[PDB]
Amino acid sequence: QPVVKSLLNSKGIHYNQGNPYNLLTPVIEKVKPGEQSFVGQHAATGCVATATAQIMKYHNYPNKGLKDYTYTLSSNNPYFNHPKNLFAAISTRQYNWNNILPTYSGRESNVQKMAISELMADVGISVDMDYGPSSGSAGSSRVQRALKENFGYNQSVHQINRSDFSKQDWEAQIDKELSQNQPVYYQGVGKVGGHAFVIDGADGRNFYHVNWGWGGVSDGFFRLDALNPSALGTGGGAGGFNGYQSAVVGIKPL
Numbered sequence: 001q002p003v004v005k006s007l008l009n010s011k012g013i014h015y016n017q018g019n020p021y022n023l024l025t026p027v028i029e030k031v032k033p034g035e036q037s038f039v040g041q042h043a044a045t046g047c048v049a050t051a052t053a054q055i056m057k058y059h060n061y062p063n064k065g066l067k068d069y070t071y072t073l074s075s076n077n078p079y080f081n082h083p084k085n086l087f088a089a090i091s092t093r094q095y096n097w098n099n100i101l102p103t104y105s106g107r108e109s110n111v112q113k114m115a116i117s118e119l120m121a122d123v124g125i126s127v128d129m130d131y132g133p134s135s136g137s138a139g140s141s142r143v144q145r146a147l148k149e150n151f152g153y154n155q156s157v158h159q160i161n162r163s164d165f166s167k168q169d170w171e172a173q174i175d176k177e178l179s180q181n182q183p184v185y186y187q188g189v190g191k192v193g194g195h196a197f198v199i200d201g202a203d204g205r206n207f208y209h210v211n212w213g214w215g216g217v218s219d220g221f222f223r224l225d226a227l228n229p230s231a232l233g234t235g236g237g238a239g240g241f242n243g244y245q246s247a248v249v250g251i252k253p254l
């Protein structure tokens, strides 16, 4: 395994799911029965959107969006009145990557905050985000489609599933991406839920650098069969995103 220092860290890229990343997600409309109110707050961007947006920032691509996207929220979503349709005019977008900064500390201009919030909202919509205080998407299968069809990334973009490869061949594909300076979209499920994140480095001893999309919290080196960030888990136990794993590789503009 080649040594590759964190690609996202090298470019200062650290996104999150709350403010100021979520200033253009849908505003929560309803209180879920038995839950405290999030009414009037913007929905989380979604880990799938945050992971994808960080990779998009790494490439500062696209210059221009290719195709709009529209979808309808599930009617069992308790945070919105139904039916609820969402729309992103991605075909009209000219993303200014000067204004979409690598990270946000709060002191940025409203133009800079709106720039990342627009990208976040576009990406979330393109992957049919189930918006809420937390926001969920199917992930990989929608991400690979969105990157090519809506945002114009190269046809090299595709999903790979962990179950389709030996451990060696799986990690070899991740290694190849990193060797070509291409961060990898990655997701998995376990006993602390499902999550999407970015693989962007390797330390030569079969650990990979992970950017979890929580603004930096828990970022570090992990084995791909022990993707277990300590930021999660109440009670003091173990848990990680080690099942139903998939990735989106070949992410590049040209």
Ligand SMILES: N#CCNC(=O)OCc1ccccc1
Pocket (backbone or CB within 6 Å): 046, 047, 048, 134, 135, 136, 137, 138, 139, 187, 188, 189, 194, 195, 196, 244
């Ligand atoms: N944020 C948040 C919610 N999580 C999420 O959307 O994860 C996507 C996901 C789908 C299928 C398998 C593993 C992760």
